[PDB]
Amino acid sequence: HFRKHWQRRVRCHFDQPGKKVTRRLARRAKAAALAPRPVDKLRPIVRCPTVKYNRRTRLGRGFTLEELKAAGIPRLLAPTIGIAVDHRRKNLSEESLAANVQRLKDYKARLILFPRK
Amino acid sequence: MKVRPTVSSSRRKARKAHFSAPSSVRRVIMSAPLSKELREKYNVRSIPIRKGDEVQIVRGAHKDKEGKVTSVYRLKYVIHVERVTREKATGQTVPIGIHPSNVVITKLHLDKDRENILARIKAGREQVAKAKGK
């Protein structure tokens, strides 16, 4: 399968340990700007779409507006306290609503919120 | 070993920088040790060499020859000390070049600028001596 000019398009990854150090220093950099805060936002727990992966579960993009309201978190405050919000996703069942409400409640119990200025 | 990433242990880069140094960097390279009497007086080990300094040669074929420095030839990394000379064919006295690392300074040409150099080196030696002690 070498009918094209593969010799002029060939990528060797000798910077594999170098880019690992660059990525770890980028993670360290955002831990210095946001010193007590985590370097990641909290993400919802969703079910994988297809029938091959129905039984397994993974992290989704952001919390729905309805599960954010039931947990007691206002909309305009959630990005300010480290919670991802997805306006596209929908609940569509009580099972997806209850798991994310419990996840938001557990984040609230472990949260220390500093009083503004 | 080396630790800092700005340092280099490359042989060609070290040799390029030595032989292509400016005359200001060449002055620091041409430094000579102070004598034992001067070392216990100023708490200073070595100083860059000077036109008015008095030196004693301790290495080479002109060992134990004592005289006053007459020239600091920074182009060929040599100093010229008085009366340490050789004769050409024509009976003309020409001076022999001695590296400052082969001589020891026995008297200093002192101005206000040298006195700051002895002071600044002396300050750091007792800084760490107190740091190592207490």
């Binding site: 955002k30 010193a35 405050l77 306290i81 609503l97 472990r110 220390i112 | -």
Partner: protein, 167 residues
């Protein structure tokens, strides 16, 4: 390539770039994290010592041992199991351990100066002229027009009176 050769022949100095970075690698300032941060340690190692979490996501890969920083109803409703249309918006109502975490708990629960908001001078005269003609009958001041040019509602005027001091 030819420009690089031109520098070697030229008697122009090589402009050495100092190793400056866009983003800093250590916290700075006078706060609890910057005083307790260790430069020689890593992000997870520092957050272990602080007692906080660093990554809220899934644990990708294996960690060092002990790093602690990488994380009856009549109506059948699941929300009543988790219960403890308006909520607070600008804050949240909340209810053997490392020293940095204890210091952060004291800074969060330290009492805050109120910085109360007063009313303007012209607002005080407008409320004073309203009481001087109508006493405390807020329904009459709402229906007034010369002394209430904006048709402020009696519920709103009563709220401004209570802030002012005169009922």
């Amino acid at each position: 390539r030819e420009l690089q050769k031109r520098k070697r022949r030229s008697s122009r100095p090589t402009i050495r770039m100092p190793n400056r970075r866009k983003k800093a690698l250590n916290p700075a300032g006078n706060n609890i994290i910057a005083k307790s941060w260790n430069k020689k340690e890593t992000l997870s190692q520092n957050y272990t010592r602080f007692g906080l979490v660093a990554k809220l996501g899934k644990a990708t890969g294996g960690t060092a041992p002990g790093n602690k920083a990488l994380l009856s109803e009549s109506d059948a409703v699941p929300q009543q199991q988790q219960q403890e249309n308006h909520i607070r918006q600008h804050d949240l109502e909340l209810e053997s351990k490392p020293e940095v975490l204890r210091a952060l708990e004291r800074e969060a629960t330290r009492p805050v100066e109120k910085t109360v908001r007063h009313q303007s001078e012209r607002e005080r005269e407008w409320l004073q002229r309203l009481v001087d003609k109508h006493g405390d009958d807020v329904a009459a001041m709402a229906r007034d027009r010369k002394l209430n040019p904006y048709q402020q509602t009696a519920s709103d005027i009563k709220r401004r009176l209570k802030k002012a001091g005169l009922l």
